[PDB]
């Protein structure tokens, strides 16, 4: 019974890839899975997966200018998911 890993930030790309540096005050039990996709609806969703206070990582942004939407995920106490939080801001 909670809310999300609550910050949003993508500062800069590497015009190919992108740094994502969001909130994580500790962990909980331990965890991030982070969505990976455009907002197009096509080009399937994919997965970065990370540890500690580290939702503060960075993608591999293969393709070019196109709008990419990208969520993150907590995991907790219950081996299930605390909340998700998403932004979409592309290249």
């Amino acid at each position: 019974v909670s809310s999300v890993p609550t910050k949003l930030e993508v500062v800069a790309a590497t015009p190919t890839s992108l740094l994502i540096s969001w909130d994580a005050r500790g962990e909980y039990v331990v965890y991030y899975r982070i969505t990976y996709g455009e907002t197009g609806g096509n080009s399937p969703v994919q997965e970065f997966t990370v540890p500690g206070s580290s939702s503060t990582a960075t993608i591999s942004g293969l393709s070019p200018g196109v709008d990419y939407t990208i969520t993150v995920y907590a995991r907790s106490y219950y081996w299930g998911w605390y909340s998700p939080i998403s932004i979409n801001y592309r290249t």
Binding site: S3, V4, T6, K7, L8, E9, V10, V11, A12, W22, D23, S83, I85, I87, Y89
Partner: peptide, 11 residues
Amino acid sequence: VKSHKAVSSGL
């Protein structure tokens, strides 16, 4: 603006 690439968050 460029570098503040997520305007705000949730609660």
